[PDB]
Every structure is written in C-alpha cells, then in structure tokens.
Amino acid sequence: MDILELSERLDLQRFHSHTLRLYRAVCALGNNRVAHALCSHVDQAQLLHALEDAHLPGPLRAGYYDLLISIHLESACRSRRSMLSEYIVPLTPETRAITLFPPGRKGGNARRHGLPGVGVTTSLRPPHHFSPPCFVAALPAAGVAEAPARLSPAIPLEALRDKALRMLGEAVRDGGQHARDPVGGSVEFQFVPVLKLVSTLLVMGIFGDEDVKQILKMIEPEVFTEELEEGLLQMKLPESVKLQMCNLLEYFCDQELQHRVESLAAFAERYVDKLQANQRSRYALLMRAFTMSAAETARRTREFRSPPQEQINMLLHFKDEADEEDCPLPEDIRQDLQDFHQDLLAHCGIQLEKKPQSLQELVSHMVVRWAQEDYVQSPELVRAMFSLLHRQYDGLGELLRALPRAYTISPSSVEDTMSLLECLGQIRSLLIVQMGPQEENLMIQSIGNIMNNKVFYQHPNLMRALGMHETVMEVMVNVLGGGETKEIRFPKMVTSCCRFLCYFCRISRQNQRSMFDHLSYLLENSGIGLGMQGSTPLDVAAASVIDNNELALALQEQDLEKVVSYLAGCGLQSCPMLLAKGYPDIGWNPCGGERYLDFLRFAVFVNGESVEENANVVVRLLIRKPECFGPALRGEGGSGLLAAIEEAIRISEDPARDGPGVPPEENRVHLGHAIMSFYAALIDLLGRCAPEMHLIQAGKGEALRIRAILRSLVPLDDLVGIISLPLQIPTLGKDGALVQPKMSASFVPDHKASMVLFLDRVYGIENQDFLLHVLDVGFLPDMRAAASLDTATFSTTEMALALNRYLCLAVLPLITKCAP
Amino acid sequence: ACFRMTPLYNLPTHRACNMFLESYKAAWILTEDHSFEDRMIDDLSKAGEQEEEEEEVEEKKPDPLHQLVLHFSRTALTEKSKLDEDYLYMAYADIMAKSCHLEVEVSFEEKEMEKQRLLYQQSRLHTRGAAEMVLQMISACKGETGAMVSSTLKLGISILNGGNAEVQQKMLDYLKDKKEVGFFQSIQALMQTCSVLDLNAFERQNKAEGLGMVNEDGTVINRQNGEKVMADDEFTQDLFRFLQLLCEGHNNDFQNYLRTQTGNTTTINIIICTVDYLLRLQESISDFYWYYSGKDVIEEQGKRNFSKAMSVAKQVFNSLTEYIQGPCTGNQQSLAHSRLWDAVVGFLHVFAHMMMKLAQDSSQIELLKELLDLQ
Amino acid sequence: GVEIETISPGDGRTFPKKGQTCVVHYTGMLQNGKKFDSSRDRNKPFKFRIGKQEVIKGFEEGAAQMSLGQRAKLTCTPDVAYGATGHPGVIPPNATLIFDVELLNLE
Amino acid sequence: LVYYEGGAVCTHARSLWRLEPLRISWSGSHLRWGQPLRIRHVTTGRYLALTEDQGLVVVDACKAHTKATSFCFRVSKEKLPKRDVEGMGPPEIKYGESLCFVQHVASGLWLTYAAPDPKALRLGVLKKKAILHQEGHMDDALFLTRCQQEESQAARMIHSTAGLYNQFIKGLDSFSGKPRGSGPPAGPALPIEAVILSLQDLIGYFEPPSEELQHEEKQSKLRSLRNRQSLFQEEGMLSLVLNCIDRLNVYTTAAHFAEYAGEEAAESWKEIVNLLYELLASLIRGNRANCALFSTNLDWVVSKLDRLEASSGILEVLYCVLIESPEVLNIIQENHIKSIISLLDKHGRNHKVLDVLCSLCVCNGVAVRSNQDLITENLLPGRE
C-alpha cells in the first residue's frame, strides 16, 4: 500500500516511524558496516524520492531525512566537526594571499565585510572516506578485528546540494504564499528536516562559493547583497526551526573566526620575514659598530645573545607607545603592525541606521528581536541563541580562546600531518563506543602511525595543542573501569598505549610538565595497575616525574602515603593473579612491591643526586609502616636480611618452590629472584634516599639523624655477607656446553651494585683494615670471575657484561674515592 | 649556550611565526581593552515591540535579560550530582558582574549621583531575579572550589556593592521561605577548603628560583607560572567580602540568621566556623614569622606572601566587625564563647615582633604600613 | 552451481574475457521475491574487474557466460554464493540468489 | 544486634528510634531528664532490652516486660522517674544539643561501644557493636536528631506493609504443593482485598510527578520519589515483590491458580499480577542503583516474556531498566535478543518492542557495536 495512506492509517504511521527510529539507532555512532547493510533495505532511490515527496506525513518525512543523514553523513560529519576546532595553517602562497578584507576602497580603516563562508580556507581538513555500497562483492576471507573498518556509504552530494537549494527555495516562497497546507502538515515539519540537511552539508563543506551566496540570499537577501523575496528570518517560525536557524548561523560565525585566524597567519608570514631581514641588517651593521663604539654595546648585543622569545617580545614591545625607545624597529615597519591592529578590531566591530548591513550586528539584532518578541521555551534553544549572542559582541575573546589551538606548519609536512590527523580522528571516534576487539587493533596501528610520523617529534607544541595524551588517558580510564575489579579487559591496548604515554613524556619536558598534573589522577588508576605487565601507569608516572629537578619538588605529599599504603598491601597479602597460576603461597608480593620501590627511586633520585626534601618524607612515611620491608627487618619475628637472601637464592635454584611446577611464556614468575629483586630495590631506594655528604659535614640535625637511623636499620655485617655471596659462573664442559645462568632466575650483579651504592652513600669506608676486609671477601672473587670470563667464549655472555657494568658503576668509583 | 647559539634570522619560518603569534596575543590582544557590557545589558534589559501588541492580560513576559536569568535558574535548580562546567555561564556571569560597579575634592552634591547610578544598575538586575542566581548557584555548587563559585561570588559582590538593603531583604526572604541546609553546608565546606600558608611548599618554591629554569622555545626570565602558596587568596578574600556585604548596614536579623536558622532543621553556626578558619590562619602566619625571626632580612617573595596573607586577614577582621556591629548580642556571645582569644593572643604576639623587626631597615616600610593598618 | 536464462540476447560474439573489466546493470533479489540490490536505483553501472575474485563465484562465472549487450537471469546456489554465513544483515545464510543482469558494456 | 554504623545508613530508616513513655496520658509532653520510657524500632516492631542470653538486643514486641526495656536520660554519669506533668512539660532536652547519657532504669547499665575491633572492622567500614556497659566510657555521647514527617510515615510504611505480604507469601507456599482438587484450601483465607488496596495505595504513593508541574516542584518531587524508592529497596521491598511474582508465576492460568488456592482467589490472579508489575515499574523507574540491581537477574525477567497474563507491565519494567543502566546493557546475550524478536512475532506490531530495541542499541550516548551487530544479524536479512 502507498505510504500516503498512512496519513490516515495512524497506527501504521507510528509503528513505521518507530521503525525508522530503530534504523537510525542501529546505524548510529559510526557503525558504517550496519549503515552499508541498511543501504540494501532502504536504497538511494528510496531516500531521494522520500526527500522529494511533498505529500508524505510529518514524522515519517522527518524520520527519512534524519535517516539519510544517519546512513551517509554522521560518521564523516562528527569527525570533520571535531577537526573544525583546530586550525593548522600551512605556509602556502594562497595562505599568503589570504587578506582580512576583500579588495575594496569603501573605507580606509575597514572595507565592507566579506561574505562569510565564501573564499579560500587553507585549514588542514582531512578528506572523507566514502565507499560505494557494493553488495554483490565477495565476503572477505579475513577474520574479524583485522579487516579494515567500513567507510561511509557514498551518495552524490554535488546533486544533493542542488536538490537542497531547490527545496529550501520552494519552502521560502511557500512561506511567502502562507498556504494553509504546509508540506508535512506543519511549518516545523516543512522546515526542520531541510535545515538539518543543509546544516550537515554545510559542516561537510559541500557547497561552493555561489551555493553559499544563494544560501545567504534565502537567509536574508538585502543584507547579503554585494557590490516573496524576503528572507526566512521574518516568517515567525516555530522554536524548533529557530533552533536549526541558530545552527545555521553559528557555522558562519565559525567561518568568520577561521577567516580571521588565517588572516593573522598570513600577516605573521609577511611580518616575520620583514623582521628577519631587519634583524639581519642590524646584526650586520652591529658587526662594524666596535670601531666607533665601546663597552656600551652590551644591551645592543643582548638581543643576539638572547634566545628569540624575548627578542620578539622586546621588538613587539611598542604597543603602548611609552616604550618606543627600547624597540629598534623602523617606524614604517611598526606602522604595518599598528595598521593591521586597526583593521582587525574594525573587522571585529570594536571601533572605527535600521539596516544592519552585515552579519555581525544582523544576528545580534535578530536574537534580541526574537527574545523581546516572545517568551522562548526550549532550553537548548535558549542555550544556542545566547551562545551566539555572546559570540557577536565579543569579537576578540573567541579569538583568544582559539589561538592556543592554532598553529603553523611547513608546507613540506602537510602530508605527514594528514596521516596523524586521520589517526587522531579514529581515536577521537572511539571515545563514544564501548571498547572492542575490533577497535583495539585499529587504534594500536593508529598510535603506531603516530610513532612513525616525523612531525610527532618535530612539533611537540602541536602535539600538546591537539592533546591526544589526555584523550588516551580517558580511554584507559574507561577500559580499566570496564572490569575495574574483575579483570583488565583488552590488556594489550592498555600496555601498548601506556607505552605511548611513556614515549610522550620522553619527547619533551613541557609534555612531561603538562602530564605532571594528572599523576594523582593516574595514581588511583595505578592501584589496579599492578595486574598488568609491561608498560603500566606507574611507569607512566615515573616517566612523568624523572630527569627534572623542578618536578618531584612540587610533588604533593598526599601521593606518598597512598603509595606506601599500597606497599603495605603488597607486603601483607599474597599476590592474587601470581598465586592463581599454581605458585606456592608466600604472604607478600615482591613484584608489586618492587614496582613501587623503583617508582619511589625515580621519585626521589634525579640527575645523579638525591632530593633531601622528598628523601626525608619518604623515609619517614616508609619507616612509619615497617610491615612492607619484607620477611626480614621487621624486628620481632624478623630473621636476617642476608639469611632471607640465601632463602631466596636456594629456593630459586630448587624447583617446585620457585615456580608453579608445570622463560616458557617469557613472563614466568621466579619467586626467589623476585624476593631478592625486591630487597635490592629496597636498599637502592634507601641508598638514593641517603643524605648528602656536604650536609653531613655541615652538621645539620635531621641530615645526621636520618643516616644514623639507617645505620641502626641495616647492619653492615649482613651487607658484607651479601658482598661475599657467590655468583654462578658460566662453566665450560660437556662438549663445550656453556652452563649459562638466566637473569630471570639467577642473582644479578646489578642487585649487588644496589647494595654497594647503599653502603657507599650511607655507611661509607673510614679505615684501611675494614676497607681490605670488605674488598677481599666479596669483591675479589667477583672481579677474578670477570677477569676469567674476559675471554673469547665468555665475554659476550650477559653475566660477563652485567659484571662489567656492575664493576664500572659501583665498585671502581667506590675504591677510586677510597684510594688514599 | 647563549654565547654559542644562533640569532633569530636562521630560525625556521613556521617556528618563528608560531613564536610571533604566541608573543603577539599576550602583548597586544590580552592587553587590549574594550568595554561592551553596558550595551550588552542595556539591550538585554530593554524590551521592545510589546507596544504594538499592547497586551493587557498582565502575563508579564520576560525581557531578554530576564529569560537568561530564568534559564540559569532552571539549570541551577535542576538536580545533578556535579555542577557541570558552562563556559557561556563564565562569559555571561563575568559580563553580568563587572557591568555593575563601573568604577580631587569631590563634594557630597555630585558624590551621590554615582551612588544612585550604581543602585540603578543593581536595580536593573535584582528586580529581575538576578538576586536568586547567587543563592541557587552556591546551594548547587555542593562545596567544591571552582570557576563557578568564583564567578558567582564576584557577581554577588557586584550586585551587593554599597550594601543594597533591598537585595539583602530578598536574600533573607528566599532563605526563610525555602528552608534548605545545603547553602550553609556548601559555605562551611567551601571556607574549610580555603588554604593557609605552608612552610614546606614555600621552601620548595624557594628552591625553584635558585634554578631559574626557562623554556626551550626561546627564554622566559623567571616565569610567572601558578604560585602554590595562597593561590586562592582572591577567592577567600571575595568570600569574606561577600559575607561582609550581606551584613553591611547593621542588618541585625540577617546576622541572627547567620548565627542560627530556626526554619532550617540543621543549624550551622558559621560565625564559630569563621573563627575556626581565623584560628587556622593564625598558626600559618605565626609559623611564617617562626621561619623569618632568625633571618635578619626578609626576601621579596616572602614580602609578597605577607601582603597577600594580611589582605585576607584584613578582610576577615572587617567581616568579623560586621557580624557583631549593631550590636548583635547573640554574635557577641558566640565570639566570646569561641576560640577567638587564642587567635587574638597569637596575632598580638606576632605583631609584637613585626614592627620591631621591620623598623631596623627602610626596605620593609610598605609591609609595615599595611601591617599597621591590619592591627 | 550457476544457471543462465537469456532474457534479451545481445551480441553473442564478444564474450567477456580476461584482461578487460565488465560493466553491468545488475538487479539482485532474494528467492522469496524480495529485492535486495540493484544498480539502476543508484543510477550507476556497476563495473567489476573479472578474474580477480572481487565478487562471488556464481555472479563471476554467470557474468562470464553471456556476451555483450545480453540480459540474463542468473541463478546462484549458496555453494557459489555467500552460503553458510550469508551477507551479514542483508542476505540470510544458505539462501539461493537470483540476478537480472544486463551486461551493458565491456571496458 | 545494635551498632554504631555510619554512612547512608544514618540517612536510612533503620537509624530511627521512637520513644514511648510509660504514661498513658500526656505521653507527648516535653522530656524531663530521667523519666522512664521505652524505645521501639520503626520498621521491625522490636524493643531494645537487656535480654538474658545476649545482653543488649532488640527483643520482639510480644516479650517487652517493661523492666528490661525502659531507660532514662541524664546529663552526667553520676547516680541520679519524677511526678509526670499533665501538660506541655518542661522543655529541656534539645535536638542536636543538650547532650545526655542514657542508662537502663532497672539494670543501671550505660550503653557504650564494644571496645574490641575484629578483622571486619580492621580495614573495612566501621559498624561498632553497642554493649550496655556497667559504667561506660567518656566519648559515648549521643546527638539527638529530628526525623522529617515523610521519613516517619515511610518508616511506618515498611513495617505495616511488609508483614501483610509476608503473611501472603506464607499463605502462597502453604498451598504451593498439595493441590486443592475439589475440597477446601490449605489454610487461612488470604487477604485479597486488603492486599489489593495496599497495592493501589503504594502505586499512588509511588506515582511520578505530573508533567505540568513547574520545574522547581518537579525536581523536589523527583528527589522525594528517588528517596522513597531507595529507602524501600534498602528495606528489601524489591526482594519481597520479587518473591511475590515468582510465587505467583508457577501457575500458568487462573485455573492453575484455582487448583491450589481456590476459586475465590482465581479471578483476582490477573489483577494482582498486573498490579505487581505496575508497582515494580514505579519502584524502579529512574533509579540508578535499583535499575543496576537487575543486572544480576536479567534472564529472570526475560523468562516471563512468553506469558500472556501481563506483557505490558513486564515490558515497561524492562524499558525502565534499559533507559537507566548501561551496565545492564552489557549483560545482553544472543538468546535474549531473539526472545525480544519473538515478542514481535507473537504479539503483533507493537512499537514498544521497537522502543525496547532502540534502548538496546545505545545507552548514555555510548555505542554498543556487539548489540547493534546482533540486531542487524537476527532481524534485518529475513525481512519478515
């Protein structure tokens, strides 16, 4: 039956409208595979005819128009809309030719305002992905989560925009007819779906220059003349149409904003070149200034002995006109900037009649006229109309809030930025979807493309302005929140992205300083970060604090006691997922405890010296909770630390107690190795928390007091016992089979270096008899072992190279200082 | 590196343009001044084309400003766990606020016209429900410091300049006929979250300028990044300035309302709480003297720290004067029974060695004269 | 598993061979009388590179069987079609397909 | 067992105590320090008492012998019943101020927290057992706080309301087995009319506020509605009604209900199951936590879609859960969606089913591609 019958068959009309709503639901939020599937059920011809049918009912007509937008437009529209908030300006000749005003002579201070949305826009906007919907093609043999995601179903937009223009032109003149039979039965049904379609196509930028000119003519003809026929704004529309009208206006306001930004970029391009030439000329003239001058050249050459930021600051330091003498620029060049400051404000309507004659005070007049003419009821309509109203008078504040996201790039890297922006669109698109196995591999390869991109390292400022780092930190927050307690679903993407965060911190300190704010925010998420192996939020925090003395100096105390409460939790109970693998039970977690220990090591030790302020508070809070040191050093019930090390070494060497009794999986847990790794990081922590010698000879109370506490803590007799503890050596025999111990399951020389650094920084060596007494027992067998392994077959071994690093990091500098 | 680096003209053009635009915005556009808020609210507050309809129902449709007021009332009074950020509310509230005050022997003949003009500008707003914006926003902010409570607080001060009695009356009537505790709960939490001086933070700050770390993209000399000691001084000062304004003019029953609320089921004696905060301030100021007493000279950052601390302390004492003036016997009893005396003796002991320390040298004459008006 | 019935024979001489693409205005429809695809609705002739396995078996061999300018009725079993999985959300698994194909042009 | 329990429990009905003085006349007089008076819990009908076996517990209301239950209030711990005042009484004890220590009038023991801390209170939330100590500690001071009239009325609601259906449930499983055949029913006649009247009152008591109401009163009524819904779930009314539907669900039709319950109850079976669904929807509509409580038993409601007695009510219950909790959406599995499709195949073109599917796709603006793929896989290609 004809759908026009449903205008009387109401029950069918409601059911089918709800059906169309379900159609717009299943294909919503970038589900282009379902959108392509739906293209079979509703065809291109079906949609186009439903657009052009003027006898269709209201809800069904609106549903079909919205459905067309959902099938074809929304996936590309959302991503492009998001990219409208950033303004990357390449250095191109058409960018150079971009001027604030079109060529005119009406006003010297300011010409007539250019037509919004008409002209050249050089902002880097990624192209859309349109795949013609082909259904007879063979189904791919590739498995899921590896095949590329479906793109938007293609549809002729060049003809579609012509259809849209014809439709709205007919609707405008029908409004002038004031006919008693509106299309769809109501004014809002006659206008809202059409305006929504024009809004979306405007966002895509399908319209040409003349198409936008026609749109302005049908919006308001007389105001938009360059050198019933009445615009839509005088037809007393309903509120829903007013809402879509606001959506139409805000796009042109955005286009004006982008035009201003590009005008600034063009003037910046010309002015920088002129200033570069002038500064070169001044430098060349100042070279011969030494013949007729003297030591007063200091503040002349301060520019050339000072980096460019304050150079341009003092060069531009002439706005108030009370500081001209400091500025060495010629007055005509300064006049160029002053004139360009004049017209920019005039363009923004600052300073330089029933016809507004321009959009700037046309929309403001429109909004105030609507508000005074009737009581607006729709809340989001009020939100939209007053957001516009705030945007009109304030010509500069929006520019001030748009400049931090503005940036200029070299033309040679536009294609480099293309891939980065496309992957940025992909990860941004994943913020609105529940995390899935299909989405993980596409976003891991996206961040891999970020790693491969040169501009990712070349322009850290642009990276920070784009702010992918915070967006990725939310996507971790959601993925850990899903299964926040039970299990970390999609662990591979978690560790692959925290790897990107660690690299991001290492790109630059400004990126690190920006990341420094979220540490506590990262710290709550690090509570379950012990579950994952590899790159973890704790590692991200360490990379966000390390190699900067300024960082960890403003590190708030509240983080510290929560970290050591986690250490207490590590020490009071067995590790859950480690114990679930059939391992024998021990009442504490060496691996998680080690993680916090090396984290605090990065927290308190920077650039080769200890931070005293962080050092005393960490040792104070750590020593307040002795339960996390391990089986030893607890006092009552606590055996020797050295004895616990022989417990760990022999349990590590003996199977069925070090492992599950079943590396084979490259992440096998070795309990004996982990316990002593924890002990080594515990003592390396205390060693790097040790007070400095200059404060010690300074005699300051707390500085002496802490070290005296550490001496009462750790007896040096156990330490020299650990020094005397042997190392398993690669032996020759059995047809030359080298018995090579594995670092994953053997005592490493770097542990011993941790204890050597501790005794050097805390205990020290004062006398010769005990100096030799510590040298001969443990350093001598190891150095002889290294000398013996210094051969053809044993030098290349990990044990030998680790001994080489250990001796040259901890042993040899210690005895170099103890040489006299 | 400064003696070994390259001049400006060898820098890449795209980098140079980025540096130029960054310098340009701070040096020209932020510094640029433009006043438009007066013709904002004149157009919003005026209603047009109702003359043509000439309707006599008395329906009283809102004027364009009043629609804004109703809309923000609706989003203020809607029930949500968190008061989600609205940048337009930032824009409109700042526009709404600073458009009111707009401010050599001036005489009492012409002195009054600026006052009644300020009253006219406030009357343009409080007659339109703008007075309810501050109460609803403070009730809905739930006691967390933020942009909204700052902008709303500045609006409250703006509409309450000169102690507008009628505005105070509207405040009192709304609190009385709504009888909600969340307002004073928010006020108590917000004031309890106000910061005091920290020695550890101060010393950590002191270590920073010894480094004098600059940025890589050029150089900024001793950058003016956010100070971690007394960052919320403007907010705390504004909060007590607002509390002072809502009791200015000896609004006796309003002061008794602050001390106790019969209508409210739960009563929070904010007067006692205010004393508690002043008490918390006295240890910080005393210990900040107890870091400089040994040192013969006080450095510049410490001088600025004293200035911002005592500006807030002056505002607190001015407020505390306001609650008890009139005299309000209930408040006077609350002050006497509270721990005000401990703060008083601590401040006196601080003031004991202030002027003696500062009088030794001529470099602390400023900080001495502001301290002198503080006592 | 594909069968051809001519509807309006065309050339009968220049059969589609390897090395040249085929341009067709097909019309796919389910065996239950339900249309699911076409090319005239999109107003664009569907062109496929024959011999490179972009389309299903039945359509490929069927399109290779007729000649230039020939309209044919193509019957494809699920064995030469998508079969046990169908086309997700469009064609149910294990269904027989019928195509009205007019091979309008070659290259 | 009585506890010093914190959190929302202090904003819950279980923290309310009603005092009943021993005086028949002028029982609402102002409290003078030290008159004898009983303490009763609002929602359980239990009286605090010094029991013989476990010291301080809340004994049932049928065994309060007025000796172990009565108590008295004094400002201090010193060894301090007067002549009752036939009027307003001297207003002395204040709400939130005028601190008092409560002592057993007959035993002379003062209430105080149990000092030992178990492993439950070692790191977790602190519920502190109260022991009627002989003398007690110093910091056992008790603040006295008002209850709002709606709180008091609601607290009386649970206590009166729960017992009726508890009796109804025990009447239900009394004839769960042992078919009546042609003889008399199992036991006492079930209060069909009283239950139906209570159900109608509860539905009206949980009626959402009307659309025409102004935004201020609409939000205030919404807050009251959420509070009452949360309190009733916190008192377990959701579990009790779940027992009601589950117990009535064993009979397919009224004849099946007749064969065990009786002819007189068979007719009301349809009405009661419709009313139970309506109240259930009114209980859960718009509730974040209560809707989240149905993520555990999603298949429980899914199991009853095939029933013909009440499809609209359970569908509304499903819709209210769906439009509220995305975590419930994460529990959806391929059998459930086919069952939803079976609703369309067995009940005609009901657009509410489409609305259910629409809610199934997206919740809180978050796309669920797994469910969207299942919808297009199991619904679209058939085209039937």
mmCIF file of C-alpha atoms in Angstrom, chain D residues 2 48-51 54-57 68-71 102-114 129-136:
data_model
loop_
_atom_site.group_PDB
_atom_site.id
_atom_site.type_symbol
_atom_site.label_atom_id
_atom_site.label_comp_id
_atom_site.label_asym_id
_atom_site.label_seq_id
_atom_site.Cartn_x
_atom_site.Cartn_y
_atom_site.Cartn_z
ATOM 1 C CA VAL D 2 22.756 -2.798 67.737
ATOM 2 C CA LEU D 48 15.584 -2.537 72.908
ATOM 3 C CA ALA D 49 16.091 -4.653 76.018
ATOM 4 C CA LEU D 50 18.607 -6.262 78.349
ATOM 5 C CA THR D 51 17.956 -9.857 77.352
ATOM 6 C CA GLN D 54 22.861 -11.851 74.674
ATOM 7 C CA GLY D 55 22.654 -8.717 76.859
ATOM 8 C CA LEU D 56 21.531 -5.697 74.807
ATOM 9 C CA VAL D 57 19.377 -6.829 71.869
ATOM 10 C CA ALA D 68 14.455 -4.588 80.634
ATOM 11 C CA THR D 69 13.086 -2.142 78.042
ATOM 12 C CA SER D 70 12.605 1.126 79.942
ATOM 13 C CA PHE D 71 15.514 3.592 80.130
ATOM 14 C CA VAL D 102 21.155 7.010 78.659
ATOM 15 C CA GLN D 103 21.106 4.421 81.425
ATOM 16 C CA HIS D 104 18.976 1.338 81.999
ATOM 17 C CA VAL D 105 16.415 2.240 84.653
ATOM 18 C CA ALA D 106 16.335 -1.269 86.190
ATOM 19 C CA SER D 107 19.793 -2.666 85.415
ATOM 20 C CA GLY D 108 21.766 0.542 85.900
ATOM 21 C CA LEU D 109 23.932 -0.139 82.849
ATOM 22 C CA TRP D 110 25.010 2.558 80.352
ATOM 23 C CA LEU D 111 25.218 1.954 76.608
ATOM 24 C CA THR D 112 28.719 2.165 75.102
ATOM 25 C CA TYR D 113 30.504 0.828 72.021
ATOM 26 C CA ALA D 114 32.161 -2.593 72.274
ATOM 27 C CA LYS D 129 28.693 -3.135 68.429
ATOM 28 C CA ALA D 130 26.939 -1.418 71.328
ATOM 29 C CA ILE D 131 27.201 -3.043 74.759
ATOM 30 C CA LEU D 132 25.125 -1.847 77.716
ATOM 31 C CA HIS D 133 28.245 -1.398 79.861
ATOM 32 C CA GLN D 134 28.062 -1.164 83.661
ATOM 33 C CA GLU D 135 29.603 2.333 83.731
ATOM 34 C CA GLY D 136 30.765 3.100 80.195
#
